[PDB]
């Protein structure tokens, strides 16, 4: 036993007592590659997404903060219920909501555009594809905006960009 109850006579010893107060003595003497490609492509998509953000809103949150909180619920903001009626027959509240939605699209620099399909029809989609960054394959589907609504949003974005150009012309 390395621990001695009796103290050593000739050899040096170091004492040891426990909490009870009892004395003792010692002796001193292909899924991974494709997933990595997908993650790299999505990181490049995130960098191109945050590169287009205006500097006034870029400092307010990190890319992690914008990705976790302000993308999917932002995607819920950007797709409200919109009736297929022209802008001349819209109400004042609908015009204000349209102006606010176009302003929030301009703040994040998101613009709809036309894309081609092999089936023979045209589709509308955002220039940064943020729908891959939010929706999951197992999630239940949601009704997207119609062709007329997305085309109206795109043309209102274009005329609002020209409105901002002429605003910068008249203030300067």
């Amino acid at each position: 036993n390395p621990v001695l109850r009796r103290p050593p006579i000739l050899e040096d010893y170091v004492h040891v007592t426990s909490t009870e107060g009892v004395r003792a003595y010692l002796v001193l003497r292909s899924s991974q590659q494709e997933a990595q490609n997908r993650m790299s492509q999505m990181r490049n998509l995130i960098q191109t997404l945050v590169s287009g953000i205006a500097p006034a809103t870029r400092s307010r949150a990190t890319p992690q903060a914008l990705l976790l909180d302000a993308l999917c619920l932002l995607l819920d903001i950007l797709a409200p219920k919109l009736r297929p009626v022209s802008t001349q027959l819209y109400s004042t509240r609908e015009k204000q909501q349209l102006a606010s939605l176009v302003g929030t699209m301009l703040a994040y620099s998101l613009t709809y555009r036309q894309e081609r399909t092999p089936d023979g029809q045209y589709i509308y989609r955002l220039e940064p594809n943020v729908e891959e960054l939010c929706r999951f394959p197992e999630l239940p589907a949601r009704k997207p905006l119609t062709y007329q609504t997305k085309q109206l949003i795109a043309r209102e974005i274009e005329v609002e960009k020209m409105r901002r150009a002429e605003a910068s012309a008249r203030v300067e």
């Binding site: 991974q32 997933a35 006034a56 976790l68 302000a70 619920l73 999951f136 197992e138």
Partner: protein
């Protein structure tokens, strides 16, 4: 501008919560001899909001006109690295963690270019310059050991407001020289008051039970609570007490992973949740947040004698994930250890 950008406070007095700390930081920066600040707390507490209020009190109304600067730095391996910084005429915010392992160079070269460069104007601009080194908890230790000598050789020229979430990842050599400013997260009543003030600023009417559910389902994160409140506003404008709040697809995926471990504990379900976790990882959510959400949804199902061991395992696997390089293997190890523990718990 969403509901997390159109409704942010301007000055320190305009905060809806932590008003006595706002008064303390107002008196701190009024004299002009303020030390290096280290702001910390949880995510969504109001840290960056209070840093912008501090910069709004320090300088004029010219701190909000931010610009983006792209700087190409040279590594010791002679490989050029682009870093994106936010700049102004009054301060400078750098996120060196985007440079990864080269962040020390951003400490050793970029910081000097803001510290050995004197201010061009001494009347409108004050005697010092503020450097917001954002997410310094994710910085390398060599960068922080190169940070102490830059912040103390040029005390009279540059100030550092280091923003982080964990000061424990910041070395105590930094924390000794700098003032620790703590930003607590708002309480449930504070989040309900913020949501009610936002809705009354938008002409809305928000039932108290729905505001309480929005506050409870955001884990005391005000940004996520405001964004899901706007999601509830868009989804159904007549606000009901039992309104389905749009839970995020990341959280729904973690819920389905938890219910998949509950329903069947087999290696093909392990491969399926590996696919779900890969889908989350390719969506670039950081794996610490994925581990936090997995544990938060996971312990709601486990028994009272099972919560602590799963929490300790989660902490160990998060530590090993931060120590290593690849996160999928450590997340798979966490899910495999949890399903082995559940199998042992349900089989006896």
């Amino acid at each position: 501008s969403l509901w997390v950008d159109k409704y942010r406070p301007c000055s320190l007095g305009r905060l809806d919560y932590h008003k006595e700390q706002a008064a303390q930081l107002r008196n701190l920066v009024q004299c002009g001899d303020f030390p290096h600040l280290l702001v910390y707390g949880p995510s969504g507490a109001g840290k960056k909001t209070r840093i912008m209020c501090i910069l709004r009190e320090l300088y004029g109304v010219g701190v909000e006109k931010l610009r983006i600067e792209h700087q190409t730095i040279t590594t010791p391996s002679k490989k050029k690295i682009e870093i994106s910084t936010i700049a102004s005429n009054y301060h400078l915010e750098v996120n060196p963690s985007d440079a990864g392992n080269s962040d020390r160079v951003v400490i050793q070269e970029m910081l000097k270019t803001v510290a050995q460069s004197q201010q061009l104007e001494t009347n409108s601009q004050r005697d010092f310059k503020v450097v917001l080194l954002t997410e310094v908890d994710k910085l390398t230790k060599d960068a922080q050991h190169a940070l102490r000598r830059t912040m103390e050789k040029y005390m009279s020229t540059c100030r550092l407001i280091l923003c982080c979430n964990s000061t424990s990842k910041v070395i105590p050599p930094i924390r000794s020289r700098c003032l620790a400013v703590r930003v607590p997260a708002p309480s449930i009543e504070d989040i309900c008051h913020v949501l009610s003030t936002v809705c009354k600023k938008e002409g809305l009417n928000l039932p108290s039970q729905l505001a309480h559910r929005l506050a409870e389902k955001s884990c005391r994160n005000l940004r996520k609570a405001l964004l899901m409140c706007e999601a509830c506003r868009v989804q159904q404008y007549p606000f009901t007490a039992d309104q389905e709040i749009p839970e995020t697809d990341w959280e729904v995926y973690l819920r389905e992973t938890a219910n998949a471990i509950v329903s069947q504990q087999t290696p093909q379900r392990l491969l399926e949740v590996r696919g779900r976790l890969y889908e989350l990882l390719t969506h670039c959510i950081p794996p610490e947040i994925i581990m936090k959400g997995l544990l938060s949804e996971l312990l709601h199902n486990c028994d009272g004698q099972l919560k602590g061991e799963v929490a300790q395992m989660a902490a160990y696997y998060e530590h090993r994930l931060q120590l290593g390089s690849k996160a999928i293997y450590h997340l798979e190890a966490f899910v495999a250890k949890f399903m082995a523990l559940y199998k042992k718990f349900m089989e006896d």
